[PDB]
């Protein structure tokens, strides 16, 4: 109920090391796809952990 919010901007949101890693168990993008994530540009991304 007090999830932290970290603003991520002005960087490259690389996902090779993220997706190719087997550490994660479940990961679904319901609005985008990893294949087109590389060639897509975003304004700001917040991480809520």
């Amino acid at each position: 109920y007090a999830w932290n919010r970290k603003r991520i901007s002005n960087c490259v949101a690389d996902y090779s090391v993220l997706y190719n890693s087997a550490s994660f168990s479940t990961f679904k993008c319901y609005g985008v796809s990893p294949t087109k994530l590389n060639d897509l540009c975003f304004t700001n991304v917040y991480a809520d952990s």
Partner: protein
């Protein structure tokens, strides 16, 4: 009635007036998808709710 099925993953967009009935499992990552299943191997066909 879930008998209606539709394809979800494809290697590339199908050309006009093309029929695709292949049932081989799809791989969303760089890792190989051998056999009938594997890491993040998704069946191309999803039922209709």
């Amino acid at each position: 009635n879930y008998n209606y099925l539709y394809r979800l993953f494809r290697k590339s967009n199908l050309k006009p007036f093309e029929r695709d009935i292949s049932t081989e499992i799809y791989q969303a990552g760089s890792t190989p998808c051998n056999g009938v299943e594997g890491f993040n191997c998704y069946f191309p066909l999803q039922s209709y709710g």
